[PDB]
Amino acid sequence: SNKKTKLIHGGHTTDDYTGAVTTPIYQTSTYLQDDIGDLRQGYEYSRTANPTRSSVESVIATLENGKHGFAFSSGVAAISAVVMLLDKGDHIILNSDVYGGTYRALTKVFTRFGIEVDFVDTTHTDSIVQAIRPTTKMLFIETPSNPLLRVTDIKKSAEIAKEHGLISVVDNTFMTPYYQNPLDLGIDIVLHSATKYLGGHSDVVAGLVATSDDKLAERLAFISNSTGGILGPQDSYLLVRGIKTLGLRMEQINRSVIEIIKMLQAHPAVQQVFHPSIESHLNHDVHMAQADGHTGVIAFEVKNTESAKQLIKATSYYTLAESLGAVESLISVPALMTHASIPADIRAKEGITDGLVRISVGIEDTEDLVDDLKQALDTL
Amino acid sequence: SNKKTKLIHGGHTTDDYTGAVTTPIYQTSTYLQDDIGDLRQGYEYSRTANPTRSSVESVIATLENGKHGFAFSSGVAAISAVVMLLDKGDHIILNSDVYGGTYRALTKVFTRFGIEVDFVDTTHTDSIVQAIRPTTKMLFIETPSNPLLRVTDIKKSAEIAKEHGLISVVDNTFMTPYYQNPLDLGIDIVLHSATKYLGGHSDVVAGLVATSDDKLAERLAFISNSTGGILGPQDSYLLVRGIKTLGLRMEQINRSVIEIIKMLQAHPAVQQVFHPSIESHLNHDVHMAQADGHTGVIAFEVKNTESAKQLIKATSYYTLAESLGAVESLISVPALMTHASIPADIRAKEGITDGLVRISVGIEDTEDLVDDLKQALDTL
Amino acid sequence: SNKKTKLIHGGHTTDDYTGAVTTPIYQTSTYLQDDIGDLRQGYEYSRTANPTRSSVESVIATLENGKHGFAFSSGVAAISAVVMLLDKGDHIILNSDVYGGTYRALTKVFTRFGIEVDFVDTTHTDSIVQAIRPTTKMLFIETPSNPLLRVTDIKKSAEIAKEHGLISVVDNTFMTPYYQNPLDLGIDIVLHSATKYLGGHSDVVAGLVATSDDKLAERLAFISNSTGGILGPQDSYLLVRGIKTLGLRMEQINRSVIEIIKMLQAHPAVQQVFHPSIESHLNHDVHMAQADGHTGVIAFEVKNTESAKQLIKATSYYTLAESLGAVESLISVPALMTHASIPADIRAKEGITDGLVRISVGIEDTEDLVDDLKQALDTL
Amino acid sequence: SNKKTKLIHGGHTTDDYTGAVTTPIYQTSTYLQDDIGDLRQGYEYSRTANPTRSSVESVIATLENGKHGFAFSSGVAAISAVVMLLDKGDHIILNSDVYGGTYRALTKVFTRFGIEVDFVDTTHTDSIVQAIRPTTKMLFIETPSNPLLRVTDIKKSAEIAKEHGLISVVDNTFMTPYYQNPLDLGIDIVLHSATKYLGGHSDVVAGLVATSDDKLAERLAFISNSTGGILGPQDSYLLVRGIKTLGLRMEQINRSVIEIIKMLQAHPAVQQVFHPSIESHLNHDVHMAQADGHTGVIAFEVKNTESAKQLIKATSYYTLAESLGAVESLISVPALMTHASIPADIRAKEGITDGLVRISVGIEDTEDLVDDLKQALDTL
Ligand SMILES: *Cc1c(COP(=O)(O)O)cnc(C)c1O
Ligand SMILES: *Cc1c(COP(=O)(O)O)cnc(C)c1O
Ligand SMILES: *Cc1c(COP(=O)(O)O)cnc(C)c1O
Ligand SMILES: *Cc1c(COP(=O)(O)O)cnc(C)c1O
Ligand code: NA
Ligand code: NA
Ligand code: NA
Ligand code: NA
Ligand code: NA
Ligand code: NA
Ligand code: NA
Ligand code: NA
Numbered sequence A, B, C, D: 001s002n003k004k005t006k007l008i009h010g011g012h013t014t015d016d017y018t019g020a021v022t023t024p025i026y027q028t029s030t031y032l033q034d035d036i037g038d039l040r041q042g043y044e045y046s047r048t049a050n051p052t053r054s055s056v057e058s059v060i061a062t063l064e065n066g067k068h069g070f071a072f073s074s075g076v077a078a079i080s081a082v083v084m085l086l087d088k089g090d091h092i093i094l095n096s097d098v099y100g101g102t103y104r105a106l107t108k109v110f111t112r113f114g115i116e117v118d119f120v121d122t123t124h125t126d127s128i129v130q131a132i133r134p135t136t137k138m139l140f141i142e143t144p145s146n147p148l149l150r151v152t153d154i155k156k157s158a159e160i161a162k163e164h165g166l167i168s169v170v171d172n173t174f175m176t177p178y179y180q181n182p183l184d185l186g187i188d189i190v191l192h193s194a195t196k197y198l199g200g201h202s203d204v205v206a207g208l209v210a211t212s213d214d215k216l217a218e219r220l221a222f223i224s225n226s227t228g229g230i231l232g233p234q235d236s237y238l239l240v241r242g243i244k245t246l247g248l249r250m251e252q253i254n255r256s257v258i259e260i261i262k263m264l265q266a267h268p269a270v271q272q273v274f275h276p277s278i279e280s281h282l283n284h285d286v287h288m289a290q291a292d293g294h295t296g297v298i299a300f301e302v303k304n305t306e307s308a309k310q311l312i313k314a315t316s317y318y319t320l321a322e323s324l325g326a327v328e329s330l331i332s333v334p335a336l337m338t339h340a341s342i343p344a345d346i347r348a349k350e351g352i353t354d355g356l357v358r359i360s361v362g363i364e365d366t367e368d369l370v371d372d373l374k375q376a377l378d379t380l
Helices: A003-009 A051-063 A075-083 A100-113 A126-131 A154-163 A214-227 A233-244 A246-266 A284-290 A305-314 A344-350 A366-378 B003-009 B051-063 B075-083 B100-113 B126-131 B154-163 B214-227 B233-244 B246-266 B284-290 B305-314 B344-350 B366-378 C003-009 C051-063 C075-083 C100-113 C126-131 C154-163 C214-227 C233-244 C246-266 C284-290 C305-314 C344-350 C366-378 D003-009 D051-063 D075-083 D100-113 D126-131 D154-163 D214-227 D233-244 D246-266 D284-290 D305-314 D344-350 D366-378
Strands: A033-035 A068-072 A091-095 A116-120 A136-142 A167-171 A189-193 A207-211 A297-301 A318-320 A329-332 A356-360 B033-035 B068-072 B091-095 B116-120 B136-142 B167-171 B189-193 B207-211 B297-301 B318-320 B329-332 B356-360 C033-035 C068-072 C091-095 C116-120 C136-142 C167-171 C189-193 C207-211 C297-301 C318-320 C329-332 C356-360 D033-035 D068-072 D091-095 D116-120 D136-142 D167-171 D189-193 D207-211 D297-301 D318-320 D329-332 D356-360
Touching: A003 A051, A003 A233, A003 A246, A003 C366, A051 A068, A051 A207, A051 A233, A068 A075, A068 A214, A075 A100, A075 A189, A075 A207, A075 A214, A075 B214, A091 A100, A100 A116, A100 B100, A100 B214, A116 A126, A126 A154, A136 A154, A154 A167, A154 A284, A207 A214, A214 B075, A214 B100, A233 A246, A233 B233, A233 C233, A246 A297, A246 A366, A246 C246, A305 A356, A305 A366, A318 A366, A366 C003, B003 B051, B003 B233, B003 B246, B003 D366, B051 B068, B051 B207, B051 B233, B068 B075, B068 B214, B075 B100, B075 B189, B075 B207, B075 B214, B091 B100, B100 B116, B116 B126, B126 B154, B136 B154, B154 B167, B154 B284, B207 B214, B233 B246, B233 D233, B246 B297, B246 B366, B246 D246, B305 B356, B305 B366, B318 B366, B366 D003, C003 C051, C003 C233, C003 C246, C051 C068, C051 C207, C051 C233, C068 C075, C068 C214, C075 C100, C075 C189, C075 C207, C075 C214, C075 D214, C091 C100, C100 C116, C100 D100, C100 D214, C116 C126, C126 C154, C136 C154, C154 C167, C154 C284, C207 C214, C214 D075, C214 D100, C233 C246, C233 D233, C246 C297, C246 C366, C305 C356, C305 C366, C318 C366, D003 D051, D003 D233, D003 D246, D051 D068, D051 D207, D051 D233, D068 D075, D068 D214, D075 D100, D075 D189, D075 D207, D075 D214, D091 D100, D100 D116, D116 D126, D126 D154, D136 D154, D154 D167, D154 D284, D207 D214, D233 D246, D246 D297, D246 D366, D305 D356, D305 D366, D318 D366
Parallel strands: A091 A116, A091 A136, A136 A167, A167 A189, A318 A329, B091 B116, B091 B136, B136 B167, B167 B189, B318 B329, C091 C116, C091 C136, C136 C167, C167 C189, C318 C329, D091 D116, D091 D136, D136 D167, D167 D189, D318 D329
Antiparallel strands: A068 A207, A189 A207, A297 A356, A329 A356, B068 B207, B189 B207, B297 B356, B329 B356, C068 C207, C189 C207, C297 C356, C329 C356, D068 D207, D189 D207, D297 D356, D329 D356
């Protein structure tokens, strides 16, 4: 029925055999066959299928309202598998500010295999239509994006993709299936870095993919089996376990996000704040139309590198580390940690200023997170 | 010093911090930074590097006498990473009877990305020289191969590759580093399905890669980080644990292999036996020159499908399952399980007869394995 | 600062060495010594101390505002260790309705070792004073109790224990440290079946003990080391992980508990409801004075065995299984599952009627849990 | 049939449900019941029984030729459970040099519960007969003992126990079931610290118990369920995995033991050597009558503390750490590490001289272990 119930009872996460109320961890590579070709429960080799992996695959399919789930050894392994649906000479349209690892994979790996990519500003969906070439096969969209949280209209992207025969893909990592369901809006394939919110505890690197399309699912299964970027059973188990509390975690994070944004907007040492909940944010109305909650990632401007570093030193409850979606609140400086490759003038042009801070809101008490960040900002 | 000592004390498999005599399992995705960019021990994000994965990587590099190790989510993920060293338009020479998963990946995935492949009979190394095209970049060799155990001269392959500027790769799964060290013979890259002998216990799917080449290592690290087919920490730990007993297991397997082959050659219901220890086997002398032991995989002919199936039913200690390198002895019928896709007439032409049986010798008592298989053959 | 923050940042649950943001899993039994007797970080043998176990021990000590934590292989192993603080001839006072496993251990194991026990109704604390013998050494109190949720005044129990030289112990399983802190009220020792709420995911059997008393801690450490009921590192890790979401889970459970109790009190097929939040419940005022929330365990009466069984069959979201504190809502019938040993007439006398149902409220959506249980009650 | 085959195929270590060739890890606390009291496969609560624990229990029962197995959180938890078969006023006879942890448990824990113990020299079995009191209920024997490897006649001990109505117990840790089977010689109960050889990889703390006696098994099951010192599922799994290679490891260790003892006896810086394989060792003939191999623990005398410490510093392949039965060879000095509590004069009287060295032989190459220890002895 409701979302918090579906998180607990959706998917197959018990043992039919013993009745165990959690998925057994099948730390195994192969399976007895009673006769040649007769598989007791359909398992024959863990790369092809593993019962613990099958459990987390059924969870993500259920939560995204798809039919088929796939678990990969990382988010970028999921992305790489989806890109390998295409051939040399095929073309992909992506949003201009995709995740750095996605940008790296596409422009430094798959470009050597002859896949062509263009990065366009998808906040206006007619820019997608202009970029469509005769060779375009795929539209790949993150929303909201990192680190400036640009929003793309998912449903219009799906219609454009359908009209032009494109496979549509949404990287739904930042919103999670608790708040945004791209398959319900016509998207062909949805994927996640489960390393972030889904696992939720900073202790699994994993990617998840769901689709309702039988033929796309069969092609993904073939690629997964052939290139072998499969999630292991122990990580599959920890993913299933972490997903149980996804709703509670996301709701705590959202309460804190609202209060933190009020504080940031009021504070004199903060300039621009980037988050889709802000009413003046581009495509705010579009985000509310396609999601019923918010990501915990917020970016905001302080004055310069020195203020950003002192902010980090002065906070007691914001932890300096890579990644997002932890139970701890995380803090980082994109210009130094994710975009330090880009020359400074182009960084500034894109809005990645020296004093741009990104926080990933965790599940600490709301008042503590607000008060801690405010008192640290007061030291500026 | 000697091999069994190096298995125990080679690589870094203790905890410098606590002194723990086994590698801690870092079930973690990210790492505190004391200041922006300052990593306490060089770790920042588990996809890029994880201390448990680093441990198994240092073991495989040590055991193969290389400098750099890489752990992937499966054997075929390791193979896929190595193939991705090449670009569209590049050409690969492989032995004609490569592992089915390798054949599938190359001819159904990477061919769509414009990598060109030819499968040639490398048992004569001048067939490699004939196949070399202006676009050839890589020579990929398994030895001995599956399921007929064809042997390829590793050292001459390495010289040919050096002379023509080719990256040379050996799939060393069947022999393990305990018996065959391709990097010592001039090969650029050695790889393994650690799913088999290295893990040794049928409970991890994993691939391992080693090289001494700094620049190839840097390219593999970039591909691993970008396409994300990384082995998880729990599987990395179980791999390190299984490798400790590799020498004892391989030596038990070899004692049984010798006795089983004597029995098979003497038995009237057995026709041809395929194994590199047989003196009339093609390139027997070459195998002894490049290895100091034997794989546990043996193939042999019985009369037909019915005899093969009754053999399986009559054995008490041979287990019908996919994979090899278990502690249990495994039995299978290639024509029904690995080559059933190939039309029957071409199967017979290649020597994959209906009555071709493959066994993977385990670590059960030698006399039991010999006696069990003999009494089952007597029922034919 | 506030409770939800302390759950995330309290205790030592990172790796000082690598910076890993989660506790490494030390699957290890022993530790290198640089010289005889010099331990790098104080570890020498995992039974005596293990760094992953040390992490969960520091969490429970922090959450209960104690100084010393201890992790055992189960709740009853923790209880057994605490009982072994006493000698033959010593006497224990416990509440009359202690957990069945505690009753079993005391009256069928430790009674054979000459420990004497009396079970008294501690809802009136003067009954403790009357039961105190010259040989009494320990007062052991659960509050609230199972399955009728009787409440005992913790602070008065602590004063009585101090006045008469008794070691005071509270089994704080049902309330968790999120809502009730016995050490802050003068109790000597607090313990938990971490199998329930603390782990929270039905996937660890474990006991935890905390104290502020240096000398009691030293005696518990000696008993733990000597009788060896230690929690393993993998379970220790999963406990630390589950505790992160304890606050969010308990708060969801409490919202559902309030609404479910309203429904139960209004429903015509329900007679008596047992829960400390009900204002007419014995020692309701005492519970509010010593706790700032509620357990998720509720008991209530339907008509008979048949109604209880049909209730179970008609619910979609209440799961029939043993244990409590899961993310799933659990349902059971004490007279058939925990008290079937007791003759029926004595069952009825104690209030364990045939139609007494116990539910453990999980973290499903509140409206679903209320509506599901109501519609099932309507079928009666 | 033969021992190495029984190690692989004995016990139930596959999944009947999926066919998985390894035991699934049931990281779970509780189990769905289809109706009240109807258990799908007999499981209801993991403390009472867990399917992964059940697997390792069936292995130890099979390997010791018993009927019932029990897995505890440590060796001393197994010992404590067996001691709790007795009541206050009952008396136990143990060998005079039992393991220090066993001595500690008995004389500092269970003595407070009124169990009486006498430690006698069981190398002459008539000393057992003399020590038998009217209150004696149990005979507890280690053979061979630590650190001087005294041998006790198991079969005569069993007959004495039967004649006088005693429960007989053998701590079979040092020999393992691969070489010595006390239940076959009439002993009632056999137990192990699986922390040592059985796990074999220094990464599990665990105890195992086997018996053929239905009534003793029922009493052990009740004590295990009631005091809760149960082994967890992950450790149970690693135990099952480690036991697979027990035969190969023990045989490698035995080859090295023979050669090392030759070297030690010939070396001028070595005085007495203690090991049951030495023909002049007390009860050498008795050991050969009840075992078909040897423990890897050897003790030998050098001159003094300084020589012992320099020996440790000069070895490359002997590791200074607590415990035994690792894949690594371990070295220690009892007078400083296990018997430093005992005054020096009594240490010397018992034979625990300052220069007494204990080694636990691992699975490194035999020639390396011999040569390394010899060259280090030459520096004396
Ligand atoms: C309610 C519920 C569903 C239905 O989810 P929708 O959001 O309506 O698609 C599925 N599974 C479970 C377990 C549920 O409780
Ligand atoms: C002997 C030894 C080596 C050297 O191995 P080679 O085969 O000579 O290359 C390396 N590491 C360890 C731990 C050794 O014992
Ligand atoms: C707030 C806080 C504490 C203090 O907890 P009290 O309830 O005041 O005893 C301890 N640790 C952490 C991490 C905290 O945030
Ligand atoms: C041979 C064998 C046995 C019999 O063992 P004994 O030592 O004769 O008691 C039991 N189980 C298996 C799997 C065996 O192979
Ligand atoms: Na479900
Ligand atoms: Na669709
Ligand atoms: Na080493
Ligand atoms: Na080279
Ligand atoms: Na902390
Ligand atoms: Na106190
Ligand atoms: Na078996
Ligand atoms: Na007997």
